[PDB]
Amino acid sequence: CHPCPWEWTFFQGNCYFMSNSQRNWHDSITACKEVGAQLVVIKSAEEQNFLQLQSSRSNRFTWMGLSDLNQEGTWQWVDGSPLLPSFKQYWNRGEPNNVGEEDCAEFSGNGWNDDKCNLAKFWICKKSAASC
């Protein structure tokens, strides 16, 4: 037994998967579901701080489970939870700007950015760690 599957990352009881391939936002949701996970939903500042660091180090644009697809300007996580006021400090200066219609969020540099959902980027899946 192992708390997390091979190649996954463990942080505070959860296992994360930083993909090595790219998909568009919608296809990233599916990829995670197939492996019993979910396109990463950030529940705490600590989590955010941990993922932001790994992502900036990866030097890769990465999708998170966040979007304003149903209602422009209103950011909602894929689990259904809404984006809280304390998390809005993480958008990159000048973001989100919806330039060209960007309804999906990604880790970019030191913060978040909204981009076209049909673009292919890397993604992070999240699921509970196994205790044993």
Ligand X SMILES: OC[C@H]1O[C@H](O[C@@H]2[C@@H](O[C@@H]3[C@H](O)[C@@H](O)O[C@H](CO)[C@H]3O)O[C@H](CO)[C@@H](O)[C@@H]2O)[C@@H](O)[C@@H](O)[C@@H]1O
According to the binding rule CB under 5 A, does residue 68 interact with Ca ion?
Answer: yes
- Interacting partner of 109 out of ligand X, Ca ion, none (Cβ under 5 to 8 A depending on kind): ligand X
The residue among 8 and 107 lying less far from ligand X, judged by its C-beta, is 107
Q: Which is nearer to ligand X, 80 or 100 (CB)?
A: 100
Residues 1, 132 contacting (CB under 8 angstroms): yes
| DSSP symbols for 62-103 | EEEEEE-SSSTT--EETTSPBPPGGGGGGB-TT----TT---
Cβ-based nearer residue to Ca ion, 15 or 117: 117
**β-pairing verdict for 104-108 and 111-115:** antiparallel
> Among ligand X, Ca ion, none, what binds residue 103 when CB lies within 5 to 8 Å by partner kind?
Ca ion
Instruction: Record the tokens describing residue 87, joined without a space.
Output: 């998390």
Site for Ca ion contains 113 (CB under 5 A)? yes
Instruction: Fill in the amino acid letter for 116.
Output: K
Other residues' Cβ atoms within 10 Å of the Cβ of residue 56: 14
Binding track, positions 44-83, relative to ligand X; x by CB under 6 A = ----------------------------------------
Check residue 103 for interaction with ligand X (CB under 6 A): no
Contact assessment for residue 34 and residue 123, using Cβ atoms and an 8 Å cutoff = no
Report the interface residues with ligand X, using CB under 6 A: 95, 97, 99, 102, 108-109, 113-115
